[PDB]
Amino acid sequence: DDMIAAYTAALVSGTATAGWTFGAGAALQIPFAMQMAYRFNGIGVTQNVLYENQKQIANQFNKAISQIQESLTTTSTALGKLQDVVNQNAQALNTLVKQ
């Protein structure tokens, strides 16, 4: 589990520092606001819309992250198929023992 966490941390750090370039080749650094303007340009929205509304977009991003973090402590229906995987393996072995 530590190595998988290390892999995901490396992926998230590379996204937050180098953007999209490190998937193809080496990592090419870019400040995060210019990368987000490049992502906005790839939908159809122009580049100025990010730079003129940067604080609102950052606040909405942080609030959505906090919403997911508050939701994961409460609800239990999420992660409902990993539990199905482990339950099915356990039930198969117990059925072998009981047969």
d(CA 45, CA 93): 55
Does residue 34 belong to the site contacting another protein (CB under 8 A)? yes
Q: How far is CA 96 from CA 8, 43, 87, 91, in A?
A: 37, 54, 14, 9
Which of these segments, 1-9, 10-18, 50-58, 64-72, binds another protein (CB under 8 A)? 50-58
* Residue among 47, 59, 66, 87 that touches another protein (CB under 8 A): 47
**Interface contacts to another protein, rule CB under 8 A:** 21, 24-26, 28-29, 31, 33-34, 37-38, 46-48, 51-52, 54, 95, 97-99
